[PDB]
């Protein structure tokens, strides 16, 4: 999150990030596998 590539994937003006954008950004960092990616998606707040 502190890294700047994640800031690249962030695009909404009010902060925040779409779940799909989160998935592909955290996949591009290539540090988490698929299960951990889905687990982070689950642990996210996932506001409507």
């Amino acid at each position: 999150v502190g890294s700047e590539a994640f800031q690249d994937y962030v695009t909404d003006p009010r902060g925040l990030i779409s779940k799909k954008d989160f998935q592909k950004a955290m996949d591009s960092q290539k540090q988490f596998t698929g299960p951990e990616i889905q687990f982070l998606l689950s642990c996210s707040e996932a506001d409507e």
């Binding site: 890294s3 700047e4 590539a5 690249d8 591009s28 960092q29 290539k30």
Partner: protein, 48 residues
């Protein structure tokens, strides 16, 4: 501050034994800070 001129030049590692330092940097820090940013900084063409 002066070394920034030579990063994006196509002939950076001349009079130096290896010529793949650009590719090693891209493979090392590319996936954290951004592969496209690495290409822009190092004067690299990803397809080429």
């Amino acid at each position: 501050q002066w070394d920034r001129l030579v990063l994006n030049t196509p002939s950076f590692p001349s009079n130096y034994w290896d010529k793949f330092v650009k590719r090693k940097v891209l493979d090392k820090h590319g996936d954290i800070f951004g592969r496209e940013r690495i290409a822009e900084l190092l004067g690299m063409d990803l397809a080429s």
